[PDB]
Each structure stands twice: as C-alpha cells, then as structure tokens.
Amino acid sequence: SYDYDLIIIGGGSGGLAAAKEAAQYGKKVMVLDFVTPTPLGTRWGLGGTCVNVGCIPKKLMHQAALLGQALQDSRNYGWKVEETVKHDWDRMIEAVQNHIGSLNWGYRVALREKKVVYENAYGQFIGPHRIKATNNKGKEKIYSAERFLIATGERPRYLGIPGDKEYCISSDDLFSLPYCPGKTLVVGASYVALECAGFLAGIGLDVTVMVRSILLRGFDQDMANKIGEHMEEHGIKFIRQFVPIKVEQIEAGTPGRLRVVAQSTNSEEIIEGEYNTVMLAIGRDACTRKIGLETVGVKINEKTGKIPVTDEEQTNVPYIYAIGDILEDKVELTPVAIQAGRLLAQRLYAGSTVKCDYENVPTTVFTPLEYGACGLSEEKAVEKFGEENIEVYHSYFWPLEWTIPSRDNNKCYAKIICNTKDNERVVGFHVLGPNAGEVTQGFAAALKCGLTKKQLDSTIGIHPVCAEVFTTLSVTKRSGASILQAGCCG
C-alpha cells in the first residue's frame, strides 16, 4: 500500500533509536535527517544534537578541563610535572571532531546494516500520509507511510538584538570553532551555559558569565547557588542581572574583538565590555514550526512550540507520533528520548504495553564541580508535601583524592529529601561532587523501587568512595545542627 511502514523525520537520538528498534521487527523504515546550517554557517553529520553539538562534545571538553586539574594534582602525588602546562585548543577540537566523525559514520552503517533507508534531507508534511523531502542541492521527492515519527528536536535560541546572529556563537558553533576563543563571555545561566563557561575556564580562557536572573532555573536552587559559588571561587566571572542589548564587532579575526553592551534588569544602568568571543546559551527552540504540521492536522502549542502528546507518545493525529525534546512537558535528555523511541517501536510492532516512564529521571550537569540529582528539588518537594512532612538530610564531604593536593575541602555536598508521611521515602536525591553522574545512576534505580531512609541506613557504604556519604546521613536541616570539620583545612 504505502511507500514505507514508518518514516522518521530527524535522525536524532530518539530518532535513530526508534528507527533501529522498529527495523528490528521487520518493518520498512525511512529516516530522514537534515541539518540546517548555523548563521555562521556550521554543519555536521548524522547523529543528532547529543553526538555533534551536545553530550558527547560537551562531556569530552569537560574532560580536558578535568585533566587540567589532574595535571595539577599529579604534582603532590609525586609526579614531576611543570607548575603550569599549556593547552593547544586546535589539537583538542580536532580530536573531539575526529570522534564525532566516527560516531557519524557509525550511525550511518548502523542504519544500513539494519536495513533502514536513510535520506539526507529536510522533511515537511504536505498532506495526509505524505511528506516532502528536500535534499541539499534542491531536488525534492515525495514519500508516504502508514505512520510517522517526529524527532526533529530543537535548536539554540537567540536574543533578537543587534549583532547576535552576526557576531555571536552558540553551542552549535563551539564544538567545532577553529580558534582559542580567547577571552569569552557566556550569556545565560543554563546548564549548557555553565558547563561551557565551565570547561572553557578550565582550559585557561578568561571567562565571564552574564545572568539575567537565577542560576539553573528549574533545578534545586540551593544546589545551583553552590555551583555558582564554586564557579566563582575557581576563576569564572559573573555579572548578575544584565542582558546584553548590542554586540559590535570592534575587529574581525580568529578571533576578533567585540563590544558587548548590556542593560541591567533592575535599573537604567548600562555597561560595556570587549571580549574575543560571545556565546549565547539562553534557551533552545523546538524545530516544529516549519514541517507542515497544519497540512496533516497536528495541534502543537504554538505559544511555546512543544507538542502535546499521550502516554504512548501519540499526537492528536493517530498515525503521527513525536518523541524527544520537542514534547510538551516532559524531559529533554538523550537517554529519555531513546527509551521513548525504543519503547514506542515495541509498543507498536511487538505487542509491548510498556510506556516510557518520565517520572524521577536522573540528570547531571557537568559543571567544574559536577552535580547530579534525581527526584524532587527541595523547593518542589516541600511544595508537594508541605514543610512539615518533609525532612532533609544533608552533609558536606571531601574526596579522599583531594586531601593530598589539599584543595577544596568542605566544598562537595550531598542531601536527600524525605517524605515523613510515606515512611521517610526518598523523594529527592542531590549530590554535588566529582564523578557525580556515576554516583547518581544507581540511586535513581533505587527510586524506581521506593527506597526509604531506613533502607538507606541499612545499606553499608563502600570505602573510601565519595558515594558512600549517603549511607551515613544523620543531620537534618530542620534540627538546625552544623556540618563542618573540627580541623577546617582546604
């Protein structure tokens, strides 16, 4: 009957996921993926945001920044290393890209092998069960399928001020930028902002951060402030309550010099500075407005852009589904989108009845001092249950590996939120410290089995591991006791 059994628009995380999973159950599948260039004209291969301008690139650069310190710790452990080592940006970028490349080509083969058709083209709906695929050279083509998957994902959002698109770079441009961005400026307080401000500073670049309001909106604010405080204390510069209003090229080059003017958010004050680069990280917009959603009947939320869907990842149009960052009121993370896409393909062609659960999803913001969390924030939690039925156990901690180099003591920190009405159930987990991601995974798994404080205490901790601090948490926030060492060094 139709051309294909399933067509996937967007070769992204949840894209390629459902693709392979659907292909696995002998269906005819076609994935179309096309990457519209960035204002400065940046392009990249198959894979998605995570692979080319997200997780992968982000985390790796974070690595180079962490290795930086490791070089500086290595000294006290006895390694004869120079007081200050230098860093070659062009060598780094290159390496990073070389890997993304392999990831690209890998995914390609991955589709080939699973007998899935990949078309490097932009897709838009023209009418029921029909889609318009436009390639790079311009030549179009039409296809039809019994069902459709929207996995287009979003893109970096700009300010709408003089000079941005023209002189500023975004997360897309960065991971491939070909020059020491030199003194940089990061406009925004997002995880992306912070992690990037984060590794750049960690490579030695002079870094400044411009914040409209709060840090990490949506995250435990207490944890956030701490991240900031750590950020400030280790080099990063912060300007609070200031949005830029114009970016002016004082000279072009690799890099150039630029003047950024900004207007405070609470007064008439205006300030000016010149930096070598300016990256904007103030949000990202769903790529749902230019695909033909009218010509097929999809109701999205024209206001925000996200797509409302059902617990089966189904739109309002029974043969058109959407999974990923584009969904309305969900979780914008790769492993999530992949579970959705995988689970869908199963729900659909395998008789599965399992729905991708979006409750209590773990995360990790890769700031200089990582911070992973799972479950409710302190605030959100209190709000849901009421300050009297919620207790918070917290503590600081110092990583054994940090004693010898003798740095940052009483800087790492942990806390869990419990619901006294429900057997002191662990509703929220929060840790700030190294390798926080590794530390969090499993506790998330614990939440899926209803961990409780009694049960947590019953656990014995590993020693000496950062993660063990959760097994022995005796101090409550409400009791009001203090949390510090009777030595205070670091």
What is the set of active-site residues?
463
Rounded Cα distance between 122 and 287, Å, is: 12
Is position 80 an interface residue for a second copy (rule: CB under 8 A)? yes
**Contact partner at residue 152 from ligand FAD, a second copy, none, CB < 5 to 8 Å by partner kind:** ligand FAD
Locate 142 and state its tokens.
Answer: 């039409």
Instruction: List, in sequence order, every residue forming a beta bridge with 142; answer none if it has no partner.
Output: 132
Is 456 known as a binding-site position?
no
Rounded Cα distance between 256 and 167, Å, is: 9
Is 156 known as a binding-site position?
no
Locate 72 and state its tokens.
Answer: 């500086």
Least separation in angstroms between residue 260's CB and a second copy is 27
Which residues, including other chains, have CB under 8 Å from residue 184's CB and lie 6 or more apart?
200, 205, 206, 207, 208, 275, 276, 277, 278, 279
Select the residue interacting with a second copy from 232, 357, 383, 387 (CB under 8 A): 357
Select the residue interacting with ligand FAD from 39, 297, 335, 490 (CB under 6 A): 335
Is position 87 an interface residue for a second copy (rule: CB under 8 A)? yes
Whole-number CA gyration radius for the chain:
24
Instruction: List, in sequence order, every residue forming a beta bridge with 32; answer none if it has no partner.
Output: 9, 119
Select the residue interacting with a second copy from 26, 37, 113, 421 (CB under 8 A): 113
Is 122 known as a binding-site position?
yes
Binding window for a second copy (CB under 8 A); candidates: 90-98, 116-124, 218-226, 274-282: 90-98
Select the residue interacting with a second copy from 28, 39, 67, 212 (CB under 8 A): 67
Taking alpha carbons only, the member of 334, 380, 330 closest to residue 355 is 330
Which residues, including other chains, have CB under 8 Å from residue 113's CB and lie 6 or more apart?
none
Rounded Cα distance between 13 and 380, Å, is: 29
Is 367 known as a binding-site position?
no
**Contact partner at residue 151 from ligand FAD, a second copy, none, CB < 5 to 8 Å by partner kind:** ligand FAD
Is position 153 an interface residue for ligand FAD (rule: CB under 6 A)? yes
Is position 252 an interface residue for a second copy (rule: CB under 8 A)? no
Select the residue interacting with a second copy from 206, 273, 468, 475 (CB under 8 A): 468
Is 217 known as a binding-site position?
yes
Say if residues 279 and 319 touch (Cβ distance below 8 Å): no
Number of chain residues interacting with a second copy (CB under 8 A): 85
Locate 202 and state its tokens.
Answer: 């960690």
Locate 13 and state its tokens.
Answer: 């995380």
Least separation in angstroms between residue 158's CB and ligand FAD is 14
Backbone angles phi, psi at 148, to 5 degrees: -130, 145
Say if residues 222 and 210 touch (Cβ distance below 8 Å): no
Is 333 known as a binding-site position?
yes
Is position 76 an interface residue for a second copy (rule: CB under 8 A)? yes
Is position 484 an interface residue for a second copy (rule: CB under 8 A)? no
Taking alpha carbons only, the member of 170, 134, 197, 137 closest to residue 39 is 170
Binding window for ligand FAD (CB under 6 A); candidates: 95-103, 108-116, 148-156, 472-480: 148-156
Residues that bind ligand FAD (CB under 6 A): 9-15, 32-35, 48-50, 53-55, 58-59, 122-123, 151-153, 171, 192, 287, 291, 324-325, 332-335, 337, 463
